[PDB]
């Protein structure tokens, strides 16, 4: 249930492939609360690749439909992350997800 919302601006053409490791700024946000995570914090932006279920599924099938320079919104429904058990502490059960997405890669 991943619903794409792009700022415009990027190429709108490099698409993430498998065996690719690539570079986000991204934001948490929790629905109707506040933040949990930002990797603008820490200033190291999470290098990651593809396809090997390192990331949860919302924000893996998010990644495939962008492009370098864009800038998406994700909402991540409650069954393709934590819904059923919830991060502990953090996450709550049931829980609906925001994500500011930034892609500024490699490959």
């Known amino acids: 249930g991943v619903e794409i919302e792009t700022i415009s601006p990027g190429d709108g053409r490099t698409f993430p ?3 690719q490791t690539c570079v986000v700024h991204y934001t948490g946000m ?3 609360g506040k933040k949990f995570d930002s990797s603008r914090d820490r200033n190291k932006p ?3 690749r593809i396809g ?3 990331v949860i599924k919302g924000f893996e099938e998010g ?3 962008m492009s370098l320079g864009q800038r ?3 909402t991540c429904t409650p069954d393709v992350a934590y819904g059923a058990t919830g991060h502990p502490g953090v996450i709550p059960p ?3 997800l925001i994500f500011d997405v930034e892609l500024l ?3």
């Open 46 to 48: 999470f290098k990651f």
């Open 30 to 32: 929790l629905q109707n």
């Open 72 to 74: 998406a919104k994700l």
């Open 105 to 107: 890669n490699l490959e």
């Open 52 to 54: 090997k279920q390192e």
């Open 63 to 65: 990644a495939a439909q």
């Open 17 to 19: 492939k498998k065996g």
């Open 94 to 96: 049931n829980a609906t």
